[PDB]
Structures are given as C-alpha cells and as structure tokens.
Design a protein around this nucleic acid. Sequence first.
RNA 1: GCCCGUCGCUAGUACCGAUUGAAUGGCUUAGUGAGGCCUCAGGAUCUGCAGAGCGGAGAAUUUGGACAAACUUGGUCAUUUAGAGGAACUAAAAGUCGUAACAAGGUUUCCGUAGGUGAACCUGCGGAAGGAUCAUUA
RNA 2: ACCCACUCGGCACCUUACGAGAAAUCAAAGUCUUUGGGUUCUGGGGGGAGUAUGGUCGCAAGGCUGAAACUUAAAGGAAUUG
RNA 3: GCGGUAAUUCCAGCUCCAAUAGCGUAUAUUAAAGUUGUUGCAGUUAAAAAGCUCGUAGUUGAACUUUGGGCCCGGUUGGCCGGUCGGAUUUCCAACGGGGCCUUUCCUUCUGGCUAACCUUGAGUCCUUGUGGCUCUUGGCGAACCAGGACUUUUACUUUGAAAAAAUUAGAGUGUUCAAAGCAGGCGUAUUGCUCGAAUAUAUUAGCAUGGAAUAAUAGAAUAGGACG
RNA 4: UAUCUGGUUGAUCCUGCCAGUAGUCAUAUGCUUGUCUCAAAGAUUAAGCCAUGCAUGUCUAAGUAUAAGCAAUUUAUACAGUGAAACUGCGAAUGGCUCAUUAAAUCAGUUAUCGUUUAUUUGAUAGUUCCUUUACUACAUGGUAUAACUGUGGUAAUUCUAGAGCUAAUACAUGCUUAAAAUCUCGACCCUUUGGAAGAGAUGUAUUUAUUAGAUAAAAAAUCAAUGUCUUCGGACUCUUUGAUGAUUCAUAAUAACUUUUCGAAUCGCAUGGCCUUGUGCUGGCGAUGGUUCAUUCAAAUUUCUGCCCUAUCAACUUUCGAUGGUAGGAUAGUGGCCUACCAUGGUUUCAACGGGUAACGGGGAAUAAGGGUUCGAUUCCGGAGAGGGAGCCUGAGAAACGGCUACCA
RNA 5: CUCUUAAGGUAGCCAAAUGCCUCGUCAUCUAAUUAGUGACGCGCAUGAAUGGAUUAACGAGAUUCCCACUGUCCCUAUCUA
RNA 6: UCUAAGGGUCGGACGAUCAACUU
Lengths: 188, 146, 260, 124
Amino acid sequence: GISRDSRHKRSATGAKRAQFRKKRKFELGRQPANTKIGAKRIHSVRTRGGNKKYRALRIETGNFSWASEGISKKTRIAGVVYHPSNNELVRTNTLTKAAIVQIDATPFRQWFEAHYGQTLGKKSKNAERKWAARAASAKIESSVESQFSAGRLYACISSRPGQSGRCDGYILEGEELAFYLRRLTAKK
Amino acid sequence: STELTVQSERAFQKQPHIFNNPKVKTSKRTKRWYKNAGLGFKTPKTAIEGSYIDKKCPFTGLVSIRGKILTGTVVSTKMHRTIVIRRAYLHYIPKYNRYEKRHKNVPVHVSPAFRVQVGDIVTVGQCRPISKTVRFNVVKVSAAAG
Amino acid sequence: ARGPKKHLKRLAAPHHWLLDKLSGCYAPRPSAGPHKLRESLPLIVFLRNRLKYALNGREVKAILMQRHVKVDGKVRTDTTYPAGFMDVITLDATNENFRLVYDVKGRFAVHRITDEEASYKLGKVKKVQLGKKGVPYVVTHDGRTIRYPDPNIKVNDTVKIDLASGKITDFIKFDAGKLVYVTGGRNLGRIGTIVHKERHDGGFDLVHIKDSLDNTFVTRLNNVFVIGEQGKPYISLPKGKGIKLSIAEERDRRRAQQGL
Amino acid sequence: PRAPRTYSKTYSTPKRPYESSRLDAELKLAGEFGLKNKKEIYRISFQLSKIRRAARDLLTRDEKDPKRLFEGNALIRRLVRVGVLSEDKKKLDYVLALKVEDFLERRLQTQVYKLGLAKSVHHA
RNA sequence: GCCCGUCGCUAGUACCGAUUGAAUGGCUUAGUGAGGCCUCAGGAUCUGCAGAGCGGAGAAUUUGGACAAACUUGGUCAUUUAGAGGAACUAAAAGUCGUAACAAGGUUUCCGUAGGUGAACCUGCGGAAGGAUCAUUA
RNA sequence: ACCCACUCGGCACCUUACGAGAAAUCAAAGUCUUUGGGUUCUGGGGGGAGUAUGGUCGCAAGGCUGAAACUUAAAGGAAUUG
RNA sequence: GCGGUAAUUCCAGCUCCAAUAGCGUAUAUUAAAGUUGUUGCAGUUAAAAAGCUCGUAGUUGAACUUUGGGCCCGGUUGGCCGGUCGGAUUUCCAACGGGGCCUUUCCUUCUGGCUAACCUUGAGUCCUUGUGGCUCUUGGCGAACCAGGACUUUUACUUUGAAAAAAUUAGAGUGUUCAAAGCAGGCGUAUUGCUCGAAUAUAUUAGCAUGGAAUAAUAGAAUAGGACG
RNA sequence: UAUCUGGUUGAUCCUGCCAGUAGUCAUAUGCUUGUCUCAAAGAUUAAGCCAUGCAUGUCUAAGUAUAAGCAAUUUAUACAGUGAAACUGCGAAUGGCUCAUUAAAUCAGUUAUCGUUUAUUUGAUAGUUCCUUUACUACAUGGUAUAACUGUGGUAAUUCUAGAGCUAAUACAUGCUUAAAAUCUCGACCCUUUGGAAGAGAUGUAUUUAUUAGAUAAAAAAUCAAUGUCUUCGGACUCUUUGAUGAUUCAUAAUAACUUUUCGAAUCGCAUGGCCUUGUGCUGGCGAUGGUUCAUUCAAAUUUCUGCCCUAUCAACUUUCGAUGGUAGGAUAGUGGCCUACCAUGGUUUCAACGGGUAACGGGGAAUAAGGGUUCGAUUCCGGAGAGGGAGCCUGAGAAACGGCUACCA
RNA sequence: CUCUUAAGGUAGCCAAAUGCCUCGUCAUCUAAUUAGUGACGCGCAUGAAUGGAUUAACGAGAUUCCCACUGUCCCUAUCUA
RNA sequence: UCUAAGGGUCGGACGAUCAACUU
C-alpha cells in the first residue's frame, strides 16, 4: 500500500527512476491517527517483529510534568490553542506531538497547597516542620501563578500518541513559555 | 548565508531535555549542551558561547559523526544551513594507461558555528542521512586567501 | 529473499573445512550458535571428514542420539552446531579430549589434550558493559556472558573460565610482550608477540607481531587472541606452533623427515 | 548446480596446416615410434610449449627469486624422475633446448621395444 | 584504344508522395472506478456485573481517507506498414542520339558561383596547375 | 648613397644527402620498429553520396551537420618499357 | 578463376593427398589486423590539415631552494682458505645495498606518567701490583611509550602490508593403471596401527595503514594584521 | 605461443581492401561412427499457452486419547502399550526455475548504523504479583467452548459444508503464592529543643513522559541556601564513589507520575529417596517444554565511496502533484520529502546531464594466446527481480509470498 | 528530314471560375458519387505587370468532408399570446 | 463558518492606532 521508499521519488538531477521492484512490506507506511479528544479509544497494531504500536484516537487525562517542582500529574485535558505545522489542528482540537493545549489546574493546585501549605495566587507540628522547611522554595513565577486563578494551564506535548497510545507532555515554564505567550497575545 | 535570530520560526527551537530551572537563579541565561565529536576535531568556541541551535550540527546537536571523513572545496553557499562541496578526482584507464578529470558534488549540512563561503576547503564527515541527499556534515573549515 | 536461509551450497563453505567439490550440492549450513559459521566448525565436519569415526550424517546423528558428545562439558545433539575456537570437545566412551584451534595453515586442527585442560578454557573479552540493575557484565567470542567480573578487565583481553560453572578465574590483559594466537587473514594460525600496537582512532587499529623466529607481521586487532606470556602459553599448543615455515622449508622438511 | 567437472584438451593444432617439412617430420616420428595419429605429436608439443612458457616466466625473474627457485627445482626433478632429461643438464636453460623426441623416447611404446620384447614398435 | 551523359526495354534498393493511411506498445491529462486496508458508525447474534441498569463478545451493512487495479477518450512518442503519381540509383551482352574527357583529345584541363541548352555540356566572373611554360638582368 | 666585413629577422634559391620516403621528391615530407617534446582537426576499399531525412542559418540561391538499403574486386597513387 | 570438343579445376572411374572417430558447411567472434594503432597507423600526390585568425573549457606548461665531506653500525650474497664426520664459521678480501651519528642541520611540543640508562656515589670489595667486576639507594638523562591539549599546508606518485569468498587460472605433492580429472594417499605386526597431507601465487581499479620525499603541482611573510619570547 | 599468402598491372613499387588460415565452453546443421572415462542440454524465438500425474509436511518418555481402532498381555478403577483422525506447536518466506524488467537501477569491492527490527541457537537474568493489612481471597490447582466423534442432512459439481448432541489441552480465557532489610513519604502525640517521635502507607519488572547523576586538566581561600557524621559543643569534616567509546542525552541508576497494565510457570516424562510431631505430614533428583530483558548467532533493511555499453539527427533537465533545502508534525522498526503543513529557490550538466537505444540482469568468470587488447558472460557460485500482467492484503519473527488470499485485464 | 512564320508559348500551372470532347483517365473520400481533393496533360482556346506560381493572416465571398447539435427528416403531435 | 497574505498615520527591532478591497 503506502510506501516510504525513495525509488518512487525523482533523482537528485530531477531524473525519473524506473520501477525496479514491486512494493515491499518492509518499506510500508501507515495512514495517520488524527487523535481527537474524547473517551479512551485506542486501537492496538501489529508492527514488524510482532512488536506493537498503539494508535490513540480520543483522549483525556494526560500525564504532564511540572519541571521546576519536578513532579508529574494526570490532568483533565482541556483544549487546543496553537500548533506550528497546521492551524487546522487547533481548529479541530486534534492532537500530535508539539500540539500545545490547556489542561486542568486543580491537581497541581492541591499538590502545591498540600506540599507547601500555601495557596495559588489569591498545625500538626510535624506538618508545620514540613511546611516551614518547604517555605522559601514555595515561590513561583507570577505569570504561571496567573493561570491558577483561571484554573486552566498551558502545556506542550512530548509524546507521539499516534504511536504510544499515550498523551503525555508537560506544563510550560521559562522563556519557551514566554515565547508561546507572545504567540498567544499575537495570535489570539 | 547568515545566522538567523534564533526563534524566527513558528516553533520554539531549543535543545531537547536541556532544562534550565527558572527557580534557580544564575549568571548564565541558558544551559547549553555541546560536545566533542572526537578524532581530534576541535570544537569551536562558537558552539559553546553562541545561541544558535542547529540540531544537525555535530556540535550542540543530535547527529553523531562516524564513518567516512572527506575534504573538498565549496561551490554553492545558497541554501539554509546546507551547502554543496565539489570533490575533484582522477580515474585511471589502463588501456591508454592514463588518467582523466572527474568530479562529484556533495550536498552537506553546515553549522552556524562555522561561517563560510566559496573556496574554504573543507573537512566533512558522514552523519546518518539527514534529508534525502545529505549524508555529510561540516567538521572543520580552512581559510582561502587572507 | 522473504526471510533467512535454511540451505547452503558447496563451493560456498569455508575453504578450511576441506570438502571435495563433488559429493553433493549442499553442506551442513551450520546452526545458530556461539560462533559465526565461517569462523566455526560443525560436528559432522569434525567427525565424518576429519576423525572418520562416522561415514554418513546418518551415523553421525546416531552418535549424537547416543549422547556421546559434550561441548564445554555440555551435551549437545545438533549436527550443525557451530563449534569454534577455544572449545573443549571431549568423548568419554573413548576418553579422548580435544581443543579446537587452527593450523598454521588456518585449518581447524586435530589437537588432542588430557582430561585436564578439558577442565578449563579461555575466552576473549569482546566487551564489558554495564547491565541493568547496575549489574556489570562481560561477553566473549563464543557468545557467553558473565556477571560480576574483575573490574580491571577491559576489552580485547582474555580470561580463564572454569568451564561449567562459568566462574571466571585468573586472566591476562592486553599489553605488550604477551603471547597471542591469530584468528583471521593470511596470518591465521600464526603465533607471536605484541611487539607494538598501532592505534588509529576511527577504525581498525593494528598490531605488529613477532614470532619466535623474529619473523614479523601485522594484523587487525579483532583477529587477535592473547593466550599467555612469552614462552608460557596457558594451554597445550598444536604441532608447528603457528610459526609459518616457507614452502621451501616445508618440502625440505617433508623430504628429509620422510625416509628411514 | 553440482560442482562443475574440470576439463581441458591435451593438444593444439598448427596455424599452418599444409607444410611439407612439418608433415614429413611428423610422419617420420610416426614411423620411428609406432604412432596412431598427429594428435599425439601435437599433444607432446603442447605440453612442451606449456613448459617453455613456464620457463620464460621463471627466467624473466632474478636468480634467487624464491618462486623461480622452488618451481624450477620441482619441475626439473619431475622431468628427471620421468627421465626425459639427462642426469646432468639440471638447469632452466637446458629444459628450453629440450624437445619432443626426448619426451617420446620415454614412451612405454618405446622403452618396451628398446628393451626387446617386441621386435617392432607395432608388435609392442 | 579508352570513355561519357540523355533516351529506350527489364528487375530490384531506398526517397517524396494526396490518402487527417494503417498497426503495436509505452507514458499520460481529464473522466469513471473495482478490490481489500484503516476509520466514523451500525448492532443479526451471545453475555458479564419480575427486573434493573450499566458492561463486554460481536456478523451483515455503513461514513470517510489513502493505496489503486481496471476502463473511456484524446494526446504522444518509439517502431513497423499500404498508396495513385513522381523522382533518383544500381544492374544488366551482342539498342537509339551524339563524342564531352585522357595526346595541345582536337575550344588546354579543373574548382567555386550564375544563366542557358536534347544529351553529354557551352558561356560569363574569379582562382588553381593536378599544364601544353620551372627561362629574357640583355 | 655605393664597397667590403659581421649579425638579427624575411621572401625564396642552388648543390648534395647523411637521413627520409612507394616513388616522384624533401633542410623539411629529416632527426621513426632504436617506434613518446606539447597540442587541435581529419581519414579507414570503391560506389551509392555529400544523396535521403531531421535540425539549424539564410530574403533566396544555398550553406553547416550528415545516413541507410543496395552494389562491387577492385578502384587508386608514383614510376618503367612500349 | 575452370568449361566455346581432344577440360591438369565439371561429371564420374583409376590413382593420389590432409585429418581421422572424427570431418565438413553456415553464421558470430578472437588473432591474423601496426585494416582502429596507449604501446602502435596515416594525412603533398594513394582516404584524409578546418579558408584564415582570436578564444573559454580541455591538454600541456622554462629554470631555481641541503649538495658535498667525515665517522660508526651491523648484514647477504661472492670469493679465500674448511674446522668438519655433502652442510658448517672466524679471520683475510672485496661487491651490494641498509641503519645511525658529526659537519651552522625538529626531534611537532607540552603537561606528567616511567623511568633505563648514569654526570651519579653511598659504602669497598671477589680478584692478577688495578677502573679487569657486580649487588647496592639519597642530589642527578628522557624518550624506552603510554594520554590528554596543540598542530603539523595539502594532494599526486611509489614501496610494503593488511583486508580481501569459494570455485575457475597459473601452480605444488600424489601411478585416477596414463590422461582429462580428483584430493587423495602412503607405510607395519595387513590379529587389534603409524603417519604425511589436502600448498602457494595471481587476486588491480576504489578505500585503509605504514616507509619514501625525486618528480608535478599547492601554501606561506609584502599595507608585515609576520615570526619567534 | 611475436610467422602469413592469392587477386588491380603488359610488367614494377605502394596504399587499401576481398578472399584464403587457426581457434572458439558458441550455436545450428550435413556425412560418418567400434570401445574407455567424464557430462552440457527448450536461454536465444513466445516471462507464449498448458492435459495428466508429482514436487511440504511434521512426534518424542516427555501437549491434548475413552477411536464405539489394534493387540492382548498384566499392579494400577482416573489413564498408563500402540496409535488413525482432530486440536495444539513449528515449518510451509528455505530450496528449485527463469532473466522478462532494470543503465549508477542492480551488482562488485569498502564502510557505517551513536539511525534500525531480529523467530531460532547459545549464555545470562525475575523472592516483591493480593489486600484499609483479625473474623478474606480455590493453591491439593480455579472457568467455559470446540473439533476429532455420534447422528441429522443439502449440492450435478470442489479439499463445500449447515443443524443438533458429547469432550481435552503447554489451545482459549482467568487467577494466589514468598524472607528480612533498609530508603522514602505521611503521621499520633511532646516541647520547645539543637527539636523526637510511636505507627499508616509506598518502594519487582515492563510502557510513556519530565528531571537529575552519569565526575576527573593542576593546586589553595570567603560567602551564603540548605542539611549529614563526629563532638574533646569552641567546632571541624579526615579516609571520602565512579564505567566505556575517537565521540553521545551512551550504558545504567535515581525521583514524581502515567498504562483498556507486559512479565513474574495452574504444563509434561522418568525416576523415586529421605525426615518425624505418622499425617498418607514435610522435604527431595534427573530433564522436557514454555517465559521478560540483555547479549550472541542467524539474518534483514537502510547506507558511505569508486566503478557501468551505444547515442548529440538527445543540450538543457528538474518544480501539476517534491523538483533542492529548512523548521515542525505524522508514518516507519527506524534516519529521510517518506508524507503532510509552512517557508526558501534552490538541485544536475560538455568532467555529457536529461532523454533515447540496449536483440542488458550485474559480478566472479569464458574464448582468443608475445605483449598491451578485443569480444563475451541466460547458464553449475554470490547478489537482485519475477512467478500470465497490474494492484492490494491476512498470517507470521520474517512474504507484498503466489506450489497463500481478494479484486481488475487476457 | 521538310514547308513556314516577326516570333513560333519558354519558365511555370490545369479538365482549375479558363478544357468542347467531358460524367476526361488513375487514386482517394462513399455501400453507392456527373461532387470535392490529389496526380496526368497535344492545353477546343493555360501562361507570364492585358501579370504567371505560391502565399501566413483576414473574409456577412464560392465549394467539399468531418465532429457535436438538433423536428431538416422517418412523422407527426401538443401548448401559449 | 474560518485561516493566511496583501496598507496608512503617529511615536523610538518595535509599540499604538484607522480603514479598506483583493487573492
């Protein structure tokens, strides 16, 4: 069916090669998975060697890393804002790698208020010895603290959910965040 | 041609898995990753003090140089972050027992740690096909005239 | 061709097995195993063609069905089993003990040994590598793997396995002046020293060699096998001592030796 | 698909087929040695030309060339063990001066009748 | 002696040649589009945890995409191939016209160019000698 | 200006030919089987044929490029005697 | 080219000729063919120098930069003896190359790792009146080669080597009875085993490693932005 | 083994050709033909069509036995021999045939995979699997649903098969078991310190993600954020861990999470022994098949560089619809315009591209023999491609299979 | 070879709008063609600025064939003002 | 129903602001 070969392709000199051999399965290609947002629908796939690929199609509950805090949570995936390759992916809220989105904030909220004892941008003397110790690392970026009021937080993808079946990524921080923020106020 | 302004493109071009924790304060503004490629090839300062990205540069990138190492002259400096090198050579005919001039052109990728042009006789090494013709990446570059 | 290959043709086998061009289209096509088939030896080759104990692979199979054979003290029943360098083979119904090694002409040699020295062997470390759980490990030329090694061991050295427990023991490093066997090329079967190593980062470092007769020659490094100290091999060596006479010396020895 | 069976031919024809002297001498040896046809003569000459090729090949090289030494001595002791050559001409030059009648005397066909027992090569 | 061209009879080789001449195969546009693959669905049929619900196994069928066989038409090249009639060549033994060339070949010969003429060819302009002059300081 | 002498570079000449060549002839057509100073172009029996076709250039004549089938045992060169 | 009446060629017969279980014919191809010409053609008249000139590519492209001398080293041939119970080595002899020193003469350099070798000497002795002789650490050798930094202008050519599938080719050994072939086989106590083997070469053009540094190119230091320190 | 000869002419010397010669592992054909050895053979034209028949099936002590099979012969009332058929597992992708395609395509030689998957072999490798953790959950072992079989039958017809009724698994689908250890979080309380602390829980492996370590090129000081041991309570901190590659984010470990949760043995044959607290208690050998991951092998795919015959009456080609490149994504086992968005206008060439032709598969190699060369190579070995042509596809580790399937054409 | 003209129609072109004969002959287009086209040429009576031959393009010019289209027609019917 | 591209004016690689039709 599909091919990834370069024999169908023209030459460096613009030249046209012949049909040297018929299509072969070891050069095959497969049609994509325009992974949407919905109930967990995943179709497993036999790849070469009997190794398995896992085509996601409809997802919530993505596993997202928070880098500065160095933790990782599972989050009700909200929606889509920006994609560099095609804006159609935002138009359909379709998921790939590099497929920026918003997500729930409440898990990270409660983690923060649990660990540091604080609140998000508004006893048990052992717990107090914990909270005071964690104090002065309990500060964060004002901009990221902003979205906590809104309850919806920006993140990026690190997976290929059309391969893994998983939708995993990480909350934005730093100057990458600032870049995509300039992009946010520029595009939206 | 030139060097860009790093995040000119639609996507935040960066070094993957290279995290610079903003909670941590520092005098440096970015954790830069680089490397030696080996074979005594000397990594330039520009890789390490620069801000350009170029994943396909053997320095500060994710290719790995190994295989053949060639040299050749530069003839085309047009495209973005890739050039063409001419390899002149000879071919022996026993019948007449003589040689003749042949040549072959080698499209390669170039780093924006180098800054080059026509002339500029090259050191270049094999780098695990990059895009459809380009199997070679610059490693070191010579001056031409002075 | 839609898969791997289950059939080999004569005229394609290794030249050093010494098969006639006739007698078949086909040769055993050695099985998967420790040794690569072109560097290896089948049992049927060892027995039928070299030791003449059997005459057909039928009989050879019958012999293996009798379980008369072991390899490294392990019973092995495959006709096409790829035996090779430094292995052990012993037979108890005849109480003979062997050790596989090439001639100076690079042909796998009939080298009988004692019941001891079928009690140990050698293994060239092809690499060391940090296996998971933090556990290190080592490998050999005969495909074996070993846990928890001597840290000072590094690549291209050799090691004294026990035989059956694994159980590495005293070993020898790669360094100058040592004793070496050759495992490839024109120089296959030869013996000599280390006299100098020539490094070439990028591929295929070389080693110069001096034999006992001050004959000198260079090889690739992957075909090296350190075997002991100079004038002190760790094993019993075959005849000729990998010393590479000339053709003139060959025929001279033949004609003089022969007679009386 | 088995091993091909090697083969070859043991002779070679002349370039010039109609030559009085050549025909005459061939027939002379035929009558002298009790022969069957020209194929046998041609075969001896063929072996001879092979040998002289080898001779030129060796002698092009330096004396003390181990190849030439080994091969010349082996060739010589072959030729003498068959007895075509005398006991003292044992040099790569005399072998070139060698000719076919020397080969032919060592025929069984010859040595029999030489050593009586036939009274004629044809009887032999 | 040698020899030339037209004309004439016969055979054959190839060329032009109206005939939108014919034929094979590719490659193709556009159109049509099989087939299975994945996909939205569907839910004959079985079923988990009075009946309840949720929850599975699930064929037919079906949405959509890609692959794309195959077909229609046109184009198109590459190769064969028919054709009145025309126009050359070659060959023949014993044809017609003449005698252009080889001798100063009877107008010295030849080249290029233009015209003309039954034919070879004649003439004009400009060259060559392969000429029929190695030569007129006297 | 004329004369002798000398030297550069010119058009050529005369004699011999060592040498070269099929020979005529040639100070180059020599320094060649003892086969190599560098370099461009052209030719491969005669005819068909510089014809056909295609292309290109030309106002046009015409030019430049350039075949095939088919046919044939000679054609031809220098030179000797008639 | 034979045959037009007495055919040396036809038709046969007789005789004779070459090859011979093989011989001929047709077509294709190789050598012949120096008639495709690198080696190795021709070009005034036999085919063939463009009408002439300029000119990019291509091909080629003047000379020139450490030569000479001196020292040591130890070899492999060839002699002169031959000691020896056909092969043997030391001196005598040259020849032939090869290596290393000095002649104003990188040895790429460090940072250490390492020292072996002594300028050592800290004690004197085995033993010939003593530098004949060696264990022996405390000032004091780099190169003997590990390993990281830095470059070395680079190519071309060449030597050697490795790496290079087998089979085929050449070729070694061997009575398949010879031979093509094959890789066997040959020796005793053939009633109780002994053993040799199954070579080697060629294996290119590209790539790799090394030695060479003539030849042919390339670079340097001239707005000194030069060098070394 | 470096060779020539006959023909132009009245004769002579050249050029130049025709013919003659020898060979051909290079075909056919004619004539002839006794023997020995050896042995090519429908490639040439029709990768043109094919009747018939044959060419891939497979069992050990050791997967499944109630054949309503056999033998009978012997401990067995669960079976125990043999063993059809069937289930299961493996293979059927090798091999063999052919050379039509294909002109830097293949193929040769030389690399590379720090850019890929890997049935099988061999060697290594798994104490953690459940549960708010006393009235628990098959572990002496948990569950159906099917053939084979029986019988009902249809079809003109195929290896077609429909209904009903039985029954197994190393089939299918489920599901427990196990040491301590320390480390982390959470914490009742108490007592204010310089703070100590019961007890609650987590901690196999795999998958996906983020982050960190993964040192080291030479020797000494100050500070602060914290937070470890020793206190000769002022304080010091002394022994103080580091793998490999030429080179990596490598190896691997660690933290926090993720998973329609991968594995962590409900299997089989021989033997049969020891221990008492005498249960039929507890222990206990040999090997057979499975299994995660790694390594190795078998390979496989991509891939560096150099090398292809004729053609200029083929000089510009390439970009519709990737033509060249970049960034991102998707897909692939995986790099890659492989494909998709977006952007840029590049990329090849008189050192001959592109196009055309090839009566072209490439190569190792064959023939010819002074030499250098030429010609050939369907063909006994390697590599590639194809199975009437095109396309697509399931299974499997592996096929775009064709002695496998679906569709279209003839 | 003759008579004869001032010259005796050359180049070229055709049964063409010029050709009686004539529906000229041959080929083609057609099933069938006094049509058309291309060839032929003793051309009643072609023919060179009374201009000859060709001529891209243009033509409310004359003519033939093809494709599509259609009540022109087979074969007529119906509807509106 | 949307996306992109294509301007002006004012303040110093930008910021603000207004309006358009066209692909």
